[PDB]
Design an enzyme around this catalytic site. Structure first.
Site, PDB file in Angstrom:
ATOM      1  CG  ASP A 175      -1.885  -1.069   1.289  1.00 18.57           C
ATOM      2  OD1 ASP A 175      -2.637  -1.226   0.317  1.00 18.57           O
ATOM      3  OD2 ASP A 175      -1.922  -1.791   2.294  1.00 18.57           O
ATOM      4  CG  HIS A 198       5.887  15.778   8.645  1.00 19.10           C
ATOM      5  ND1 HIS A 198       5.219  16.806   9.277  1.00 19.10           N
ATOM      6  CD2 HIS A 198       5.747  15.999   7.312  1.00 19.10           C
ATOM      7  CE1 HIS A 198       4.702  17.592   8.334  1.00 19.10           C
ATOM      8  NE2 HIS A 198       5.007  17.134   7.132  1.00 19.10           N
ATOM      9  CD  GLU A 199       7.104  13.734   4.387  1.00 14.57           C
ATOM     10  OE1 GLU A 199       6.135  13.854   3.618  1.00 14.57           O
ATOM     11  OE2 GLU A 199       7.699  14.723   4.861  1.00 14.57           O
ATOM     12  CG  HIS A 249       1.543  14.594   4.488  1.00 21.14           C
ATOM     13  ND1 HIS A 249       0.654  15.581   4.856  1.00 21.14           N
ATOM     14  CD2 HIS A 249       2.769  15.174   4.510  1.00 21.14           C
ATOM     15  CE1 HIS A 249       1.347  16.707   5.077  1.00 21.14           C
ATOM     16  NE2 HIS A 249       2.633  16.503   4.878  1.00 21.14           N
ATOM     17  CG  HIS A 259       1.527  20.866   6.438  1.00 23.25           C
ATOM     18  ND1 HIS A 259       2.084  21.432   5.314  1.00 23.25           N
ATOM     19  CD2 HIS A 259       2.184  19.694   6.624  1.00 23.25           C
ATOM     20  CE1 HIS A 259       3.049  20.616   4.862  1.00 23.25           C
ATOM     21  NE2 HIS A 259       3.154  19.538   5.626  1.00 23.25           N
TER      22      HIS A 259
HETATM   23  C1  LIG Z   1       8.200  18.710   8.206  1.00 23.63           C
HETATM   24  C2  LIG Z   1       9.327  18.183   7.301  1.00 23.63           C
HETATM   25  C3  LIG Z   1       9.864  16.827   7.822  1.00 23.63           C
HETATM   26  C4  LIG Z   1       8.879  18.065   5.835  1.00 23.63           C
HETATM   27  C5  LIG Z   1       8.596  19.388   5.095  1.00 23.63           C
HETATM   28  C6  LIG Z   1       9.877  20.188   4.864  1.00 23.63           C
HETATM   29  O1  LIG Z   1      10.822  19.749   4.193  1.00 23.63           O
HETATM   30  N1  LIG Z   1       9.893  21.387   5.410  1.00 23.63           N
HETATM   31  C7  LIG Z   1      11.015  22.274   5.218  1.00 23.63           C
HETATM   32  C8  LIG Z   1      10.473  23.707   5.172  1.00 23.63           C
HETATM   33  C9  LIG Z   1      11.522  24.813   5.176  1.00 23.63           C
HETATM   34  C10 LIG Z   1      12.068  25.110   3.830  1.00 23.63           C
HETATM   35  C11 LIG Z   1      12.790  26.475   3.895  1.00 23.63           C
HETATM   36  C12 LIG Z   1      14.253  26.268   4.086  1.00 23.63           C
HETATM   37  C13 LIG Z   1      14.664  26.323   5.530  1.00 23.63           C
HETATM   38  C14 LIG Z   1      15.813  25.364   5.741  1.00 23.63           C
HETATM   39  C15 LIG Z   1      15.286  24.214   6.558  1.00 23.63           C
HETATM   40  C16 LIG Z   1      15.638  22.850   5.995  1.00 23.63           C
HETATM   41  C17 LIG Z   1      14.610  21.790   6.477  1.00 23.63           C
HETATM   42  N2  LIG Z   1      13.364  21.923   5.720  1.00 23.63           N
HETATM   43  C18 LIG Z   1      12.156  22.116   6.243  1.00 23.63           C
HETATM   44  O2  LIG Z   1      11.941  22.176   7.456  1.00 23.63           O
HETATM   45  C19 LIG Z   1       7.951  19.119   3.698  1.00 23.63           C
HETATM   46  O3  LIG Z   1       7.701  20.360   3.014  1.00 23.63           O
HETATM   47  C20 LIG Z   1       6.603  18.484   3.919  1.00 23.63           C
HETATM   48  O4  LIG Z   1       5.703  19.114   4.470  1.00 23.63           O
HETATM   49  N3  LIG Z   1       6.451  17.241   3.493  1.00 23.63           N
HETATM   50  O5  LIG Z   1       5.279  16.571   3.866  1.00 23.63           O
HETATM   51 CA   LIG Z   2       0.640   3.239  -2.822  1.00 23.99          CA
HETATM   52 ZN   LIG Z   3       4.224  17.816   5.257  1.00 22.65          ZN
END
Ligand SMILES: CC(C)C[C@@H](C(=O)N[C@H]1CCCCCCCCCCNC1=O)[C@H](O)C(=O)NO
Ligand SMILES: [Ca+2]
Ligand SMILES: [Zn+2]
Ligand SMILES: [Ca+2]
Ligand SMILES: [Zn+2]
Length: 164
Positions: free
Chosen positions: A59, A119-120, A123, A129
């Site tokens: 899945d 976290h993933e 989803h 979020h």
């Molecule tokens: C919550 C995380 C595990 C996944 C999300 C994600 O990668 N968020 C990033 C947002 C910040 C980007 C701006 C750059 C700041 C530098 C920080 C590097 C780490 N990145 C983050 O925290 C992903 O977007 C998500 O929501 N996937 O489901």
């Molecule tokens: Ca699948």
């Molecule tokens: Zn996310």
């Protein structure tokens, strides 16, 4: 907490997952342990049970990809976005992708694979979020002690809302 628009959800409570490839940063056992613990977090707060399969169609497919990998959400190299996942559904539905260009860890150093996978999977289960900065579904990565980590209340209310 926020539910994914359209309220998608799995109709079955026993789901399988498969790790299609691995990152060279950790041992296969280390990757497997991080993924298992991530799923278990959700299992303690819902009636869902996850089982690892080694061949066949699971899945939830788990894979490490880089830049443009054909799903319309290209990764961006080191830092920036870490990973992404798809809402419940068939095929690509429920799958989780991790940016292969990151340095993945099982420590307090960036980016702890367990916390990102956890976290993933939120989803993968139908959650969107949260605006609570103390929630696992909050959109920014933040290291939290992993030894006795359990799902914050906001995330509990959220999966209960869908499967409780
Ligand atoms: C919550 C995380 C595990 C996944 C999300 C994600 O990668 N968020 C990033 C947002 C910040 C980007 C701006 C750059 C700041 C530098 C920080 C590097 C780490 N990145 C983050 O925290 C992903 O977007 C998500 O929501 N996937 O489901
Ligand atoms: Ca699948
Ligand atoms: Zn996310
Ligand atoms: Ca990235
Ligand atoms: Zn992808």
């Amino acid at each position: 907490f926020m539910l994914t628009p359209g309220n998608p959800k799995w109709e079955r409570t026993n789901l399988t997952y498969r790790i299609r490839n691995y990152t060279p940063q950790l041992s296969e056992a280390e990757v497997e342990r991080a993924i298992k613990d991530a799923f278990e977090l959700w299992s303690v707060a819902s009636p869902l049970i996850f089982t690892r399969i080694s061949q066949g169609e699971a899945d939830i497919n788990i894979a490490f990809y880089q830049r443009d990998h054909g799903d319309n959400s290209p990764f961006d190299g080191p830092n920036g976005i870490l990973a992404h996942a798809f809402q419940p559904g068939q095929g690509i539905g429920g799958d989780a992708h991790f940016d292969a260009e990151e340095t993945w860890t099982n420590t307090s150093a960036n980016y702890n694979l367990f916390l990102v996978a956890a976290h993933e999977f939120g989803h993968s289960l139908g959650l969107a979020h949260s605006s609570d900065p103390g929630a696992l579904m909050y959109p920014n990565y933040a290291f939290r002690e992993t030894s006795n980590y359990s799902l914050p209340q906001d995330d509990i209310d959220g999966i209960q809302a869908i499967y409780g």
